[PDB]
Write an enzyme that holds these catalytic residues in place. Sequence first.
Site: not given
Ligand SMILES: Cc1noc(C)c1[C@@H]1C[C@@](C)(c2cc(-c3cncnc3)c(F)cc2F)N=C(N)S1
Length: 359
Positions: A218, A34
């Site tokens: 991202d 990430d």
């Molecule tokens: C910032 C933010 N604000 O609201 C949200 C929702 C986020 C995400 C946070 C995080 C940590 C995240 C991603 C996924 C994921 C989901 N699908 C495919 N790849 C990664 C997940 F499952 C859980 C998560 F905590 N990573 C990000 N880049 S965005």
Amino acid sequence: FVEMVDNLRGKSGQGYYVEMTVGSPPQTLNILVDTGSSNFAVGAAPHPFLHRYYQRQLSSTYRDLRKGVYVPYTQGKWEGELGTDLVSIPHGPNVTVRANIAAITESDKFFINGSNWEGILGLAYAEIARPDDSLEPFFDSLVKQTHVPNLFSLQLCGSVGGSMIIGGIDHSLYTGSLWYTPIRREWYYEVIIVRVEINGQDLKMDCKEYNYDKSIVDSGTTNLRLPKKVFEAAVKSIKAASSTEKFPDGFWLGEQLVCNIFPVISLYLMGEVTNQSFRITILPQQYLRPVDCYKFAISQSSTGTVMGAVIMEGFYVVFDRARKRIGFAVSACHVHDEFRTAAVEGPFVTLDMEDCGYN
Ligand SMILES: Cc1noc(C)c1[C@@H]1C[C@@](C)(c2cc(-c3cncnc3)c(F)cc2F)N=C(N)S1
């Protein structure tokens, strides 16, 4: 970097994970890659969704920092206990570092039911690390403790696979030349979009709108997220270019699924040189994602542009931290057809690119 090739796995829409080891003796875990966060956080309790979890009691090298961390997102949340331990990447560089680890003890709508990962590797900068910027991110610890170059690159291939090359670039993973865009600020991997084209047609918007309030790269986001004003102008242009077939309004808003007609999307990014830019072009195969049921993977945003998996799957992306720049090149694994392919083209003359950045 041959041993680092094909070190990423995952399922469509569930992100890309790498195998990591934590503690002594080493505990094997699958960890989400990430670039949109900065915490190394792993499941540490028997949540039903988890295949495995970090067991601190089994590690002799574990050190308690005696501090908690609460991380709420826009959707979902996790709470963890901070500490340090020895971390290694089996299919990465042959090194072991002491890194900060958030042992997740409580969560809601964080882990995905049916996914094969049990933690997250935040690859962004300390500025957005939680609870604050004094908690050193993994890659910062890796560079400080070893001779691994301050650079990593990602090839995400659209179950799914890919490569995370740590400390370098693998030239077999891309075709043509790499084109670099400056990292505006070291918090997220923030970039500046200067022009947007739908099928070669400019949106004619104030370029400051494209980066309101920011534009980021991202890997932990599936969609290409756009600011609402940019999104409604972009969708209107995509509606016009696909006038051959009629689609419901819910489909464009990501509220419903649909079961040559679709246009290419080009983003012009700020170049390395004054008044110089380059463009990256994605296909329908990138923003129309299989769920044949398809979901429109372009959405409105409140936190600015997010260049997620929709963008990244088309390209080999180099996170050149040492030179504060991000490289883009045509991916050797990207999904395309016989008529159209993803492209990285330059140089282009674009004036007033500094006005595109939001302050
Ligand atoms: C910032 C933010 N604000 O609201 C949200 C929702 C986020 C995400 C946070 C995080 C940590 C995240 C991603 C996924 C994921 C989901 N699908 C495919 N790849 C990664 C997940 F499952 C859980 C998560 F905590 N990573 C990000 N880049 S965005």
